[PDB]
Design a protein around this ligand. Structure first.
Ligand code: A1A9F
Ligand code: CL
Length: 167
């Protein structure tokens, strides 16, 4: 039993809700919140910009030190950093950005990072400003993640489309 509330159950392990991931994280304080990161951990917009703003830029400060030490992530890769005031940990995961010409096949590799964590609050990878089809992202999530994932979909219209079309 966990403290996630109001989610629709899609499969044994995948749940979904129309919610602002920032507000969800502040309420639940999950062990792991997933960020829709880029390889530079530059948290400018989309989910990343919103999470970082909610940390008063502490996420960006920590991320800049991470990059200075380790260099950029790989597309499809991840790193674990602090969750600041939002969660215990933040799993920064880089899905392919279609608006940069990146290989959508890397979406499965991106979701595989979730399997290293028993429970996560997460967005749909590569959706939104990353330019991929969110229906596809949900399908890859369900077919790749085996741990317990609570998906927050900000756009209510998109949420209804995702539920109604789910196979
Ligand atoms: C129509 N539309 C698609 C998306 C993409 C989605 C991630 O896939 N973004 C977010 N998801 C959850 N919480 C969030 N907070 C801030 C952004 C955000 C947003 N709008
Ligand atoms: Cl977005």
């Amino acid at each position: 039993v966990n403290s996630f509330s109001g989610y629709l159950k899609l499969t044994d392990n995948v749940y979904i809700k129309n919610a602002d991931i920032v507000e969800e994280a502040k309420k639940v304080k999950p062990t792991v919140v997933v960020n829709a990161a880029n390889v530079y951990l530059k948290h400018g917009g989309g989910v990343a910009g919103a999470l970082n703003k909610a940390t008063n830029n502490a996420m960006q400060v920590e991320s800049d030190d991470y990059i200075a030490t380790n260099g950029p992530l790989k597309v499809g890769g991840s790193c674990v950093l602090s969750g600041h005031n939002l969660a215990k940990h933040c799993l920064h995961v880089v899905g392919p950005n279609v608006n940069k010409g990146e290989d959508i096949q890397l979406l499965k590799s991106a979701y595989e990072n979730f399997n290293q964590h028993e429970v996560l609050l997460a967005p749909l990878l590569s959706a939104g400003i990353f330019g991929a089809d969110p229906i596809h992202s949900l399908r890859v999530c369900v077919d790749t993640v085996r741990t317990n994932v609570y998906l927050a979909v900000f756009d209510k219209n998109l949420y209804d489309k995702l539920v109604s079309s789910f196979l």
